[PDB]
Design an enzyme around this catalytic site. Structure first.
Site: not given
Ligand SMILES: CCCOc1ccc(S(N)(=O)=O)cc1
Ligand SMILES: [Zn+2]
Ligand SMILES: CCCOc1ccc(S(N)(=O)=O)cc1
Length: 257
Positions: A103, A195-196, A91, A116, A93, A61
């Site tokens: 995002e 956001t995922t 990470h 992020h 996006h 992802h």
């Molecule tokens: C709970 C496992 C997934 O962990 C995350 C998924 C998305 C984010 S984000 N894109 O909101 O920073 C952070 C941790």
């Molecule tokens: Zn993220």
């Protein structure tokens, strides 16, 4: 399996993760004129001097740079936060084109990418427990625009060849995430979600006003990554962003005049 394709992308997520239509979903558009300055907000405290990166992982992802979060080594505090939040990973996006990829948006403007830095509230003991709490995570979001190179990003860019496909990881020690920050820590903040999937409503979002600049060559290398695993049909890892969700009953606060 959820993803970002036509048949498994953000429109579809609600069927397996009904919270996708919840009351505090992320990302959102940040309407800069409607955001209210909150003089009660404190300065962010970003304390990354003892950060210990361990590994970089293509999870199908995005790619995560992971940190040792077994001690208070890299912590976020202050701002809207009560208590101490420990850095677990960062990470990005990003888009297929420089004109999209972030995002969050700012007055509907999309940036080329969004960083992020993910932190969990130490009062919950670990990340898995923290995501089950309304104040479990603090994610520091930083916009990327294309222009000059970000020297502190290059070490990340150059390892991407070794994690091209889903499930690949590589040792990634001694990386200093301070090299990814902009000069100013002015920010907007609001309560939101991952956001995922699983889209859990556990995040205090802190989005920096000042974007960092990265070069076209740097982002081009993000776009060479693959969503697929090795030996599978290739599919470039691009446009791994969720669009802005309804703000609903929320106010975005600004740390700055
Ligand atoms: C709970 C496992 C997934 O962990 C995350 C998924 C998305 C984010 S984000 N894109 O909101 O920073 C952070 C941790
Ligand atoms: Zn993220
Ligand atoms: C035949 C594969 C199943 O296709 C889907 C996989 C995951 C979703 S989602 N985005 O709801 O989790 C939808 C279809």
């Amino acid at each position: 399996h959820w993803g970002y394709g036509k048949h498994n992308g953000p429109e579809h997520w609600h069927k397996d993760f009904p919270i996708a239509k919840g009351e505090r979903q992320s990302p959102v558009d940040i309407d800069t004129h409607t955001a209210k300055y909150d003089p009660s907000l404190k300065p962010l405290s970003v304390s990354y001097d003892q950060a210990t990166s361990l590994r970089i992982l293509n999870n199908g992802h995005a790619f995560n740079v992971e940190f040792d979060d077994s001690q208070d080594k890299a912590v976020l505090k202050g701002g809207p936060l009560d208590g101490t939040y420990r850095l677990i990973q960062f990470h990005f996006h990003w888009g297929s084109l420089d004109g999209q990829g972030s995002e969050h948006t700012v007055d509907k403007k999309k940036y080329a990418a969004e960083l992020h830095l993910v932190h969990w509230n130490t009062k919950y003991g670990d990340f898995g427990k923290a995501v089950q709490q309304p104040d479990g995570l603090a994610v520091l979001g930083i916009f990327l625009k294309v222009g000059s190179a970000k020297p502190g990003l290059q070490k990340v860019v150059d390892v991407l060849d070794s994690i091209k496909t889903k499930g690949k990881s590589a040792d990634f020690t001694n990386f200093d995430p301070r090299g990814l920050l902009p000069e100013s820590l002015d920010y907007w903040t609001y309560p939101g979600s991952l956001t995922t999937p699983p889209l859990l409503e556990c995040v205090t979002w802190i989005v920096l006003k000042e974007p960092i600049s990265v070069s076209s060559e740097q982002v081009l290398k993000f776009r060479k990554l693959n969503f697929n695993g090795e030996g599978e049909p290739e599919e470039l890892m691009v446009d791994n962003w969720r669009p802005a969700q309804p703000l609903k009953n929320r106010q975005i606060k600004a740390s700055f005049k």
